[PDB]
Amino acid sequence: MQPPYIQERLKSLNDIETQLCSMLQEASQVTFIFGELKRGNESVKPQFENHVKQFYERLDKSTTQLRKEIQLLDENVGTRLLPINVNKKALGQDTEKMEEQLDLLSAILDP
Amino acid sequence: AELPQWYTLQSQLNVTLSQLVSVTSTLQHFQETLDSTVVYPLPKFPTTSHESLVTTLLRKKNIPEVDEWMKYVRETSGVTTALLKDEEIEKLLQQDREITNWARTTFRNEYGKHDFSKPFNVDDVLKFTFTGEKPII
Amino acid sequence: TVMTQEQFVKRRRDMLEHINLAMNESSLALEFVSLLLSSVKESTGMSSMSPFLRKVVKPSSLNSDKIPYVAPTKKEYIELDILNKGWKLQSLNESKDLLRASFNKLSSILQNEHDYWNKIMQSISNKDVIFKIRDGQKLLAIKYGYEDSGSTYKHDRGIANIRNNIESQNLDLIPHVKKFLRVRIFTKIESEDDYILSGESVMKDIRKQIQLLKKIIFEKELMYQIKKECALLISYGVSIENENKVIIELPNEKFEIELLSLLPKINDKRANLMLVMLRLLLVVIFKKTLRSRISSPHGLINLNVDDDILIIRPILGKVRFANYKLLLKKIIKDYVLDIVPGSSITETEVERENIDDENITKLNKEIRAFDKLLNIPRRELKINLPLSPNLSLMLESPNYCNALIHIKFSAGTAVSFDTTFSDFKEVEDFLHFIVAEYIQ
Amino acid sequence: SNQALYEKLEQTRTILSVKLAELINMTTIADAQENSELAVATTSVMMVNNQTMQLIKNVQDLLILTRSIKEKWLLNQIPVTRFDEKQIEELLDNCIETFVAE
Amino acid sequence: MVQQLSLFGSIGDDGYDLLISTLTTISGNPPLLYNSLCTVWKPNPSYDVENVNSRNQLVEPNRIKLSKEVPFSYLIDETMMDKPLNFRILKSFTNDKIPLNYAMTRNILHNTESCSPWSLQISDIPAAGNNRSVSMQTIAETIILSSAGKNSSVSSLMNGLGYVFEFQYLTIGVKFFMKHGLILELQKIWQIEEAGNSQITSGGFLLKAYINVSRGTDIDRINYTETALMNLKKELQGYIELSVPDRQSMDSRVAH
C-alpha cells in the first residue's frame, strides 16, 4: 500500500516517540527514588543505580536512532524523495475511472 | 484579557527567574556587611505621621504563607530538632551529604560511560552543435 | 480532564493577584534599598524611589551602622541545613509529580498520534497526493480533482482536508453534499399524450470516501459540461430546466437527466447503459484534453462547446439515426418495394479512416477505442432489381442531429444520378420518379 | 533545514544528558553555597522551574522534530493491461447494439 | 521571426530517472521521446562570395542546418522491440554505438524521387546585451516539403543554393510541455561520421529549456517568458543549476 521502507521509518519514528515518552517516566522514577533515599532508605540504592543507567541508555539509543533517521532522510533525498519542494500532481485518474466504467458496462452486459 | 504568546511569556518568566537568582547571588556575595548593618530611621523622617510607612519599609517579617510553608517542609523533612540531639543531626547530615556525593559520582560515571559533477561542458557541446568541432578532452 | 471558562478565569485572577503581590514585594524591597542608598549617594536612590515615597519622605532619612562581625553558630547552621534538606525534598516531590503528570498526558497524546499515523499509512496510497494547509494550524489536504488528469474546471477544485476520528477509528474527508445524476427514460403511449416513465438508473471507509468525492466532482463536471453543450442544441429538441436538469424530447421517447441529492422496469438497463456512456464520453473528453496538452506546447486551456464536448450529441445522433433508418426503410418499402414485383434491400456499413512514444500512442489508440462511439453514423442501403438497374441510398449525418441522404442510381436501359437530399419528403418523390421512369 | 535538525538534535541531546544530573546534583548541602533561607528557597524553586520543565521542553521540542521529519517523510515521496483494443471495441459494439435494441 | 528564450544545463546518467520523475511532478506531463537528425551545411569554399548582400549591409557567411526525424525502427538494433518507446530507453544509449550510421544518413541525404520533409533553420549568435538573464537567439526556419526532378536529392539542392555538407548529428531525447508554453528538452547528441559515431554528450544528458515567441518585438511577451524561465529556475534550484551558455558557443558563423 505504502512502501515497506516508509512503513519501517514510520515505525522507527513511533518507537523514537515512545522512548522519548518513557524518558519522562524514567526521570520521574529517578527523582522519586532519590526522594526516599534522601528521606533515609538505603535498600533501594541499586534500584536508583539501575534507573539512572536505564534513563541514560534510553537517551543514548533514542538520540542515535534519531541521528541515523535524520541521516537516512538526508541520504534518500535523491533515491525516493523529491530533491526540490513542489506539490505533486494527481495523474491517471481518468484511466482508472475509464477502467471502472468498462468493468461496470461489462457487468451490465454479461450477468 | 488576551494572553501573550507563550514563547515570549516563557522567555520573560525565565528572565525574571534569572534576575531573582542574580539578586540572590549578589546578596549572598554580600552576606556579610548586610547582616552586620542594622538600619534605623533618622529624625528628618516623618515618624509620627508615617509610622505605618516606616515600619512597612523596615519590616523583616515575611508572610504567614511562606512561614507556614517553611514549617510544612520542616515537618515533612522527616527529621526535626525537637526530639534529636545536635550530634545525631550532624551525623545524619554527614551521611546525607555522603549519599548525595555517591549519587553525583554515579551520575558522573554513568555520563562518562556514554558518548556525548559535470559530465561534460555545455559550452563545448553547444559549440559542436553550432560549428562542428569536437569538444576538447 | 476537561477545563471550563469559570475555572480558567479564577486561575487567571489568582495568578494575576499573585504576580501583583510579587511585584509589590519586590518594589518595596527596591524602594527600601534606594531610600537607604540616598543617604550616601543622594542621586541614584532618587531614581529608584517611588513618586509617592519622594512626596512623603525626603532623601537621607535613614542611616545604618556596622554592628560587629559575627560568625553564625552551629545550631543555626544545622537548622538552616535541615531546612534546606526538607525544602529540597519537597521540590523533589513536586518535580516527581510534575514529571509523572507530563508523562501520563504525553503518553495519551502519543498513543493518539500513533493511532493517527497508523490510520494514515493504512489509509493513504502513494498514488494519492497530500499537501499542507492552514486555516494557522497545520492540516493535511488530499487532492482528488481531475484537473491534473484532463479536466478543465476552475469552478471547484477537488480538495479534501483529512481529519482524525478516534470514535470511528478512522480518517474523515472534509471538502474544502452528495449529489448524483440519474437518467429518467420516458416512453409515449399510443394516444399522443403525456410521456410515462419506463426506466431509470440506480443510485465509512477511507477508499470509499475518496472514491465518493471523486465520483461527486466527476459527475458535477459531467452535468456542467452537458449544460454548456445544451445551449447549442436548442433547435434539436434539447433544453435546460433549472441549470441542473436537461431534457431531451424525442418523437418516441423523452430523456430527463437531472442532478439531485437524496420496481424493475424494462428500460432500466438502457438507462444504466446510457449513463455509463455519459461517464465514458466525459473520460474521452479528459483524454482528448490530455492528448492536446501532450501534442502541443501551449496545450488546451478551455474547451470549445461545438468542437470538443460531444457528450449527448453522439448518443442522440445514434438514436435519431436509428429513427432515420426506420423512416428511410419505410419510404423505400412504400415507394420502391411496393411498386416493383419483388426486390430485396441490404444494409452495409461503409468506413473511411511520426510521433512514436509510449504515452502518446496509448492516448491515440485509447481514443480510437471510443472512435466508433464518437464517429458519424453512416449506412448504405442498396436494393437489388430485376434485370441492369441499381439503386442505393447512403444515410449520413455531418452534424449529429440532422439527416442527409446521398442517393446513387444507374440503369443499363444510360442515366446516372448521384444526388444529395437534406430531408425525407424530397427522397419520397425522387424515388417515386426513379421507379416510375426507369425501373417500371 | 537538515543542518538545523542536526544542531537542534545535538543541543537537545547534550542538555538532556546534563539537565537531570544537574537537577539532582544541586540537591546538596555545604556549610554550591547556601548560607540563607533565601538561597535555599531560590535554588528549590529554580529546580522545578528551570530543570524539570526544561527537560519537559526539550522532550517536547524533540517530539516536534520527530513529527516534522515524519511529516516530511510522508509528503516528499516520489510517485511510482486488463482491457485490450479489440476487447474495448467488441464490448462497445455489444453495448451499442443492446442500447439501441432494434 | 521567432525568438528562443532559452536556458541550458546538464545532468549525469545516474540522475536521469530522478530528473524525469521530478519534472513529471512539476509539469503533470509524461516525457516525450523524440529525435531529429540535423544536417549542417556551410557555404561552398570554392565559391567566391561578397561580404555585402543585395542591400548595402555587410554580413558574415553562416552555417544553415536541416533537421528532420528518423523513425525509431532505424534506431532499434533488432534487440529492443519488446520495450516500448519511452524515457527508459535512453539509459541504454551511453556509448558511441548507434544503429544509425554514416552510410544510411548519406542514403537519406541523397534519397537513394520525392524527399522527406525537412526543417531549414538559420540561427545567428545570441544577443550581446548583458541585461537579459536568459539566452535569446534569433532563428529563421522554413519547412521543405517535397522535391522532384532528376537532381532531386536534398544534398544537391543544397549545393544548388550553394551550401556543401559539413557535419551532422543525431539527437535523441525526451521533452516536457509544461505550464504556459515552455518546452524543456533533455537529450543525447551523437556526431555521425564516416570514421565512426561519437557521443558528444559523454556520460550525461544536455538540458535545454526554451520558449518560442513569434514576435520578439513584444517586450511584454519577452519579459513574461523570461520570468517564466526564472520561475522554473527558482523551482529547480538546489538540485540543478540553470545558466546562460556562451554566445561564442551558440554562434554558428563560419570563422575565417
Q: Sheet containing C180-187: which strands, arranged edge to edge?
A: C196-200, C180-187, C253-260, C245-249, C238-240
Q: Min CA distance, C75 vs chain B (Å)?
A: 8
Please, which residues bridge with residue E141 across strands?
Answer: E121
- Containing C408, the helix (H) or strand (E) segment is strand C404-410
> Which residues on C lie below 8 Å from B89 (Cβ)?
78, 82
| CA E57 – CA E212 distance, rounded (Å) | 27
Q: Are A14 and C103 in contact (CB under 8 A)?
A: no
Q: Min CA distance, A87 vs chain B (Å)?
A: 27
Which residues of B lie inside 8 Å of E (Cβ-Cβ)? 117-120, 122-132, 134-135
CA closest to B20 among chain D residues: D42
Please, which residues bridge with residue C249 across strands?
Answer: C254
Q: What are phi and psi of C159, to 5 degrees?
A: -125, 130
Work out whether the CA dihedral E89, E94, E97, E102 comes out positive or negative.
Answer: positive
Determine, for residues E239 and A84 on separate chains, whether the beta-carbon distance falls below 8 Å.
yes
| CA E183 – CA E4 distance, rounded (Å) | 10
> Which residues on E lie below 8 Å from D78 (Cβ)?
21-22, 25
> Which residues on B lie below 8 Å from E252 (Cβ)?
130-131
Angle (CA) E110-E115-E121 rounded to 5° is: 90
Subunits with 3+ Cβ pairs within 8 Å of A are B, C, D, E
Instruction: Please report where in the chains the cell 560587629 appears, as a residue.
Output: C68
| Angle in degrees, 0-180, between the axes of helices A93-109 and D85-100, rounded to the nearest 10 | 50
Determine, for residues C369 and D95 on separate chains, whether the beta-carbon distance falls below 8 Å.
no
In whole angstroms, how far apart are CA A45 and each of A59, B111, C298, D24, D28? 21, 18, 78, 15, 17
How far from chain centre, in Å, is Cα D71?
A: 9
Instruction: Please report where in the chains the cell 536529392 appears, as a residue.
Output: E153
Cell numbers placing E164: 556543401
DSSP conformation class of E56: S
Residues of chain C numbered 115-154 and touching chain D (CB < 8 Å): 117, 120, 126-127, 129-132, 138
Cell numbers placing C393: 441510398
| CA C235 – CA C238 distance, rounded (Å) | 7
How far from chain centre, in Å, is Cα C282?
A: 14
| CA E94 – CA E88 distance, rounded (Å) | 13
> Which residues on D lie below 8 Å from E24 (Cβ)?
79
Residues of chain D numbered 29-68 and touching chain B (CB < 8 Å): 29-30, 33, 35-39, 42, 45-46, 49-50
Q: Give the E-state strand segments of chain E in sequence order.
A: 2-12, 32-43, 64-68, 118-123, 135-144, 163-178, 182-191, 198-199, 204-213
Q: Are B131 and E252 in contact (CB under 8 A)?
A: yes
Cell numbers placing B104: 553525583
> Out of D29, D55, D102, whose CB is closest to C84?
D29
| CA E27 – CA C292 distance, rounded (Å) | 14
Cell numbers placing C438: 426507369
Q: Are A24 and D55 in contact (CB under 8 A)?
A: yes
Cell numbers placing C138: 497545520
> Which residues on B lie below 8 Å from C79 (Cβ)?
81
Q: Are E239 and E22 in contact (CB under 8 A)?
A: yes
Determine, for residues C66 and B33 on separate chains, whether the beta-carbon distance falls below 8 Å.
yes
> Out of A31, A39, A97, whose CB is closest to C95?
A31
| CA D90 – CA D86 distance, rounded (Å) | 6
Please, which residues bridge with residue E68 across strands?
Answer: E37
Method: cryo-EM
> Which residues on C lie below 8 Å from E33 (Cβ)?
356-358
- Containing B28, the helix (H) or strand (E) segment is helix B6-29
Angle (CA) B58-B63-B65 rounded to 5° is: 175
Q: Are C240 and C229 in contact (CB under 8 A)?
A: no
Residues of chain C numbered 316-355 and touching chain B (CB < 8 Å): none
> Out of D24, D27, D42, whose CB is closest to B24?
D42
DSSP conformation class of E32: E
Q: Min CA distance, D81 vs chain E (Å)?
A: 14
3-state secondary structure of B35: coil
CA closest to D78 among chain E residues: E21
| CA E46 – CA E162 distance, rounded (Å) | 10
> Out of E63, E189, E243, whose CB is closest to B125?
E189
| CA D64 – CA A110 distance, rounded (Å) | 56
CA closest to A42 among chain B residues: B99
Over the range C25-58, which residues count as b (16 or more CB within 10 Å of their CB) and which as e?
eeeeeebbebbbbbbeeeeebeeebeeebeebbe
| CA B30 – CA D10 distance, rounded (Å) | 39
Q: Which of C119, C191, C197, C98 is nearest to C162 (CA)?
A: C119
Subunits with 3+ Cβ pairs within 8 Å of B are A, C, D, E
> Which residues on B lie below 8 Å from E43 (Cβ)?
none
Q: How far apart are the first and last CA of chain A?
A: 31
Work out whether the CA dihedral D34, D36, D37, D38 comes out positive or negative.
Answer: negative
Q: Are C95 and D23 in contact (CB under 8 A)?
A: yes
Cell numbers placing A86: 513542489
In whole angstroms, how far apart are CA C249 and each of C188, E10, E167? 11, 62, 68
Measured in angstroms, the resolution is: 3.0
> Which residues on A lie below 8 Å from D70 (Cβ)?
9-10, 13
Q: Are E137 and E124 in contact (CB under 8 A)?
A: yes
> Which residues on D lie below 8 Å from A9 (Cβ)?
70, 73
Q: Min CA distance, A53 vs chain B (Å)?
A: 6
Determine, for residues A82 and E22 on separate chains, whether the beta-carbon distance falls below 8 Å.
yes
- Containing D57, the helix (H) or strand (E) segment is helix D53-75
| CA C12 – CA C20 distance, rounded (Å) | 12
Strand E182-191 versus strand E163-178 pairing type? antiparallel
Question: If you write DSSP's letter for every residue of C7-19 in order, what string do you get?
Answer: HHHHHHHHHHHHH
CA closest to C363 among chain D residues: D85
Angle (CA) D69-A21-D61 rounded to 5° is: 45
- Containing B50, the helix (H) or strand (E) segment is none
> Out of A10, A20, A67, whose CB is closest to D59?
A20
Q: Min CA distance, C297 vs chain E (Å)?
A: 5
| CA E84 – CA E89 distance, rounded (Å) | 8
Q: Min CA distance, D62 vs chain E (Å)?
A: 27
Q: Are E222 and E213 in contact (CB under 8 A)?
A: yes
Cell numbers placing E66: 536541416
Q: Min CA distance, C93 vs chain D (Å)?
A: 10
In whole angstroms, how far apart are CA B121 and each of B134, C27, E167, E246, E254? 11, 74, 20, 11, 22
Cell numbers placing C133: 494547509
How far from chain centre, in Å, is Cα C50?
A: 68
Q: Are B128 and E191 in contact (CB under 8 A)?
A: yes
Question: How many CB atoms are located within 10 Å of the residue B97 CB?
Answer: 16
CA closest to C363 among chain E residues: E30
Q: What is the CA radius of gyration of chain D?
A: 33
> Which residues on D lie below 8 Å from C125 (Cβ)?
none
Cell numbers placing C198: 419506463
- Containing C89, the helix (H) or strand (E) segment is helix C74-123
Establish if B113 touches chain A: CB-CB under 8 angstroms. yes
